[PDB]
Amino acid sequence: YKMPKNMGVAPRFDTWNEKYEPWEHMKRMGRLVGTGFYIPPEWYNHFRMFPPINHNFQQEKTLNPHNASEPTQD
């Protein structure tokens, strides 16, 4: 049984985005700082009061090409 060469290291083509999505780091860093035991990085000091946009969702979870996901990149 022959496969395409690099399938061992093949990335998850649906979920590989999640890790890097801004909201994630907002939440995590949110409850990390909350402890009192972490010094907030300054980006968090900033986006604290300008949290990112709500309804932009990737094309992986929403399966539509026609959905214009981005207010910016449109």
Partner: protein, 125 residues
């Protein structure tokens, strides 16, 4: 699901009578020629969708401009008023409509029904 003929998955957001898309005996899908504009071939066609995205347009209201007289005189054709829009529109699918299975799949062979595509022949008019 790795079984062939089960590949279309579980979709609840369809309009069919089963939530399991692969038992539905109505519309067999076509993996090779389909899904240019809908993304994957499994997913429902644009005009048949029962769930809607945030920044995407939803279904046009069908007519079958006179009535905008009170509006801005300039205002053009409202993007959601469509002359011809059909929720029931049969999209050509080879495994249904052109079915080559009982043949050797040579050039002319396979059984075709013509009742799907609207006739481009001159014979009608």
């Amino acid at each position: 699901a790795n079984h062939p003929n089960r590949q279309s998955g579980i979709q609840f957001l369809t309009h069919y009578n089963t939530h399991q898309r692969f038992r539905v005996n109505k519309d067999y899908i076509d993996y090779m020629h389909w899904g240019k504009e809908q993304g994957q071939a499994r997913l429902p066609h644009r005009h048949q969708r029962v769930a809607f995205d945030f920044n995407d347009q939803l279904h046009p209201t069908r007519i079958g401009y006179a009535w905008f007289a009170s509006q801005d005189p300039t205002f053009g054709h409202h993007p959601d008023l469509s002359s011809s829009f059909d929720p029931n529109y049969r999209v050509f699918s080879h495994p249904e409509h052109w079915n080559k299975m009982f043949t050797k799949r040579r050039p002319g062979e396979g059984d075709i029904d013509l009742s799907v595509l609207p006739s481009r022949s001159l014979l009608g008019p």
